[PDB]
Design an enzyme around this catalytic site. Structure first.
Site, PDB file in Angstrom:
ATOM      1  N   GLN A   1       7.143   7.990  -2.473  1.00 29.75           N
ATOM      2  CA  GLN A   1       7.121   7.436  -1.110  1.00 29.75           C
ATOM      3  C   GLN A   1       7.259   5.918  -1.055  1.00 29.75           C
ATOM      4  OE1 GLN A   1       3.329   9.581   0.121  1.00 29.75           O
ATOM      5  NE2 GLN A   1       4.379   9.646   2.089  1.00 29.75           N
TER       6      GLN A   1
ATOM      7  N   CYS B   1      -0.960  16.804  -2.023  1.00 28.80           N
ATOM      8  CA  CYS B   1      -1.745  15.637  -1.660  1.00 28.80           C
ATOM      9  C   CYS B   1      -1.912  15.729  -0.155  1.00 28.80           C
ATOM     10  CB  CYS B   1      -1.080  14.346  -2.158  1.00 28.80           C
ATOM     11  SG  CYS B   1       0.762  14.193  -1.890  1.00 28.80           S
TER      12      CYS B   1
ATOM     13  N   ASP C   1      -7.456   4.366  -2.384  1.00 30.55           N
ATOM     14  CA  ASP C   1      -7.048   4.504  -0.978  1.00 30.55           C
ATOM     15  C   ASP C   1      -5.734   3.766  -0.690  1.00 30.55           C
ATOM     16  OD1 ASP C   1      -9.264   6.113  -0.176  1.00 30.55           O
ATOM     17  OD2 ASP C   1      -9.955   4.692   1.336  1.00 30.55           O
TER      18      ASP C   1
ATOM     19  N   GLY D   1       4.357  12.308  -2.079  1.00 34.22           N
ATOM     20  CA  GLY D   1       4.153  11.052  -2.793  1.00 34.22           C
ATOM     21  C   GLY D   1       3.447  11.153  -4.138  1.00 34.22           C
ATOM     22  N   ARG D   2       2.105  11.207  -4.145  1.00 32.20           N
ATOM     23  CA  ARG D   2       1.374  11.515  -5.385  1.00 32.20           C
ATOM     24  C   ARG D   2       1.869  12.816  -6.026  1.00 32.20           C
ATOM     25  NH1 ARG D   2      -4.670  10.225  -2.789  1.00 32.20           N
ATOM     26  NH2 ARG D   2      -3.980   8.249  -1.824  1.00 32.20           N
ATOM     27  N   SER D   3       2.115  13.836  -5.205  1.00 28.13           N
ATOM     28  CA  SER D   3       2.613  15.114  -5.714  1.00 28.13           C
ATOM     29  C   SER D   3       3.943  14.943  -6.443  1.00 28.13           C
ATOM     30  CB  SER D   3       2.773  16.113  -4.553  1.00 28.13           C
ATOM     31  OG  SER D   3       1.530  16.512  -3.995  1.00 28.13           O
TER      32      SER D   3
END
Ligand SMILES: CCc1cc2c(=O)[nH]cnc2s1
Length: 282
Positions: free
Chosen positions: A262, A215, A181, A220-222
């Site tokens: 990010q 995401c 998280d 970000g994660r992507s």
């Protein structure tokens, strides 16, 4: 500089925030006028994350062709990706329309439906075989065929039917379920294992349309997923693998979608993943 020793030099000097801010300063700025039209307000999850006009995916529809999604085309690596936000209640039908029209084989999901006690995307696929989903606005039917739950990710086989033509296709859903998280993972080992499973499926290969990766905001994660994939492919293709410059690759990808990576922690994690991944490849 090389990567692994540039890495230790930034750690010892504690300058990840300065490196990341340089990237933010140099990144491309292109117009996103279609995203900001008033009729599209409920098609965007975040007001500050929009696709550029020049690289946005267009729906094959004459009423409104807009979706918050971008085509990232990497010329030297010969890979393409579609990066998109997590679908909204009023865009789940558009999402599957795009998958169909772009001939994608795989969907890569890097978030959980609920994180930090809030909804990060709609429940956009069926959870039981006998309870299929119909998207009436775009005339598609979606059925769960099988599900394989592992410790860090889940893979699902889905059937997508175009109800207008009765054509059907098999879509693979790759769901990374253990990103924390807050922050980034401590080790890149499970993320790399997941990337290799997507690769092994054929979903990233030229005989299919581009993979769809998301995401919550799709940056970000992507961004970490496609940046790591492209950097490892370039290290395999080139005569001199130490010539691969991860900051330059990231700036190239940011010509196609704003905001990729990010935080400075995501930047450091991307370096770590490429470094460890390059040892396993050989
Ligand atoms: C058995 C083949 C594998 C390759 C690979 C990789 O390149 N990175 C991470 N895990 C694996 S497994």
């Amino acid at each position: 500089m090389e990567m692994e020793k540039e890495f230790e030099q930034i750690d010892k000097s504690g300058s990840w925030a300065a490196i990341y801010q340089d990237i933010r300063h140099e990144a491309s700025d292109f117009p996103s006028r279609v995203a900001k039209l008033p009729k599209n307000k409920n098609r965007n999850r975040y007001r500050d994350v929009s696709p550029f006009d020049h690289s946005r995916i267009k729906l094959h529809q004459e009423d409104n062709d807009y979706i918050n999604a971008s085509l990232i085309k990497m010329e030297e690596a010969q890979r393409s990706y579609i990066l998109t936000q997590g679908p909204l209640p009023n865009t789940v039908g558009h999402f599957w329309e795009m998958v169909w029209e772009q001939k994608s084989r795989g969907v890569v999901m890097l978030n959980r439906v609920m994180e930090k006690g809030s909804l990060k995307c709609a429940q956009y696929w069926p959870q039981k075989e006998e309870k299929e989903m119909i998207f009436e606005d775009t005339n598609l039917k979606l059925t769960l065929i099988s599900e394989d739950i592992k410790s860090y990710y889940t893979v699902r086989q889905l059937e997508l039917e175009n109800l207008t033509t009765q054509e059907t296709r098999e879509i693979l859903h790759f769901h990374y379920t253990t990103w924390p998280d807050f922050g980034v993972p401590e080790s890149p080992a499970s993320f790399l294992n997941f990337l290799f499973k997507v690769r092994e499926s054929g979903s990233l290969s030229p005989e299919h349309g581009p993979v769809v990766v998301h995401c919550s905001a799709g940056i970000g994660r992507s961004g970490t997923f496609c940046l790591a994939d492209t950097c490892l492919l370039l290290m395999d293709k080139r005569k001199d693998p130490s010539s691969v410059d991860i900051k330059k690759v990231l700036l190239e990808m940011r010509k196609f979608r704003m905001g990729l990576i990010q935080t400075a922690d995501q930047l450091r994690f991307s370096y770590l993943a490429v470094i460890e991944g390059a040892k396993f490849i050989m």
